[PDB]
Amino acid sequence: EYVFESPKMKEILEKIKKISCAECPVLITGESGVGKEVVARLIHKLSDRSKEPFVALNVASIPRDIFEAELFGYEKGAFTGAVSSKEGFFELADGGTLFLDEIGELSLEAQAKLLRVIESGKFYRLGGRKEIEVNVRILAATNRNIKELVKEGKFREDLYYRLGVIEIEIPPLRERKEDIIPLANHFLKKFSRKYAKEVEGFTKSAQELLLSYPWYGNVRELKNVIERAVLFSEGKFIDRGELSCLV
């Protein structure tokens, strides 16, 4: 279960409901730990293809020298040492969703190779002759400022225009103050059962302290703080002093 109790978050949820049945690539931008993975999996879940694979990938974990071999696949005998034919991630997520986390780590050649497939919709194996057609829905998430990347000369402008048809910008947690308290009480329970420590809630002073801290890690930092508070406590209530050192 997730928490959406802020007007901006509710509007984003309505946008997700409207868009989840479309057939266009989605780009999710935001700060660190805002919930981009949550938004991507919520888009996939509320979809007509929710019973299909959701291939999540990190583009920085794929070496350049074999990049196009991983994404598209190769045939037997394509290169020395190719024991047997193998498929790519595009065919693996055929009929489902392909999620690319931190899309800003791509190189220019990889960007062009991805743009060709996103435009045409069909590709070829590394050592193949027939042409493969796929039905992959592409979601891409990043935390960089993509406009500054394209202005500097690091991200292809046409690729950004192709991907940036729909923009979902999750606001920072510091602009979601009315969402801070329901989140903390959500985490405090989850760890309390997990670590078997007994605790009920936060005192008024601790709740006042929570709303004043300008979170830089957004939801993940709040989760870490709540986990530390649960671990380093034994009483039924968390007070100002327990969180004062953490903050």
Ligand X SMILES: Nc1ncnc2c1ncn2[C@@H]1O[C@H](COP(=O)(O)OP(=O)(O)OP(=O)(O)O)[C@@H](O)[C@H]1O
Partner DNA sequence: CCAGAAATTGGCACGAAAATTGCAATAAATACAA
Residue 76 near which of ligand X, DNA, Mg ion, none (CB within 5-8 Å, type-dependent): DNA
Residue 81 near which of ligand X, DNA, Mg ion, none (CB within 5-8 Å, type-dependent): DNA
Residue 35 marked ligand-binding = yes
CB-based burial label for 101 (10 Å; 0-12, 13-18, 19+)? buried
Which CB, 103 or 238, lies closer to ligand X? Answer: 103
In whole angstroms, give the CA distance from residue 124 to residue 122.
7
CA angle, 78 then 84 then 86, to 5° = 80
Residue 223 marked ligand-binding = yes
Residue 49 near which of DNA, ligand X, Mg ion, none (CB within 5-8 Å, type-dependent): none
Residue 101 marked ligand-binding = yes
Which CB, 85 or 143, lies closer to ligand X? Answer: 143
Q: Does 25 bind ligand X (CB under 6 A)?
A: no
Residue 71 CB, nearest approach to DNA (Å): 22
Nearest by Cα to 201 from 237, 225, 229, 227: 237
Secondary structure of residue 56 in the 3-state scheme: strand
Stretch that binds ligand X, among 30-38, 60-68, 150-158, 190-198 (CB under 6 A): 30-38
Secondary structure of residue 74 in the 3-state scheme: strand
Give me the DSSP letters along 107-120: -HHHHHHHHHHHHH
Which CB, 126 or 138, lies closer to ligand X? Answer: 138
Residue 168 CB, nearest approach to ligand X (Å): 11
93-122 binders of Mg ion (CB under 5 A): 101
Residue 77 near which of ligand X, Mg ion, DNA, none (CB within 5-8 Å, type-dependent): DNA
State the DSSP code for 4: -
CB atoms within 10 A of CB 114: 24
Which CB, 47 or 218, lies closer to ligand X? Answer: 218
Residue 76 makes CB contacts below 8 A (sequence gap 6+) with 82, 83, 84, 85, 127
**Contact between 95 and 49 (Cβ < 8 Å):** yes
Stretch that binds ligand X, among 28-36, 53-61, 114-122, 150-158 (CB under 6 A): 28-36
Which CB, 207 or 224, lies closer to Mg ion? Answer: 224
Can you name the residues that pair with 2 across neighbouring β-strands? none
Interacting residues with ligand X (CB under 6 A): 2-4, 30, 32-38, 143, 186, 219-220
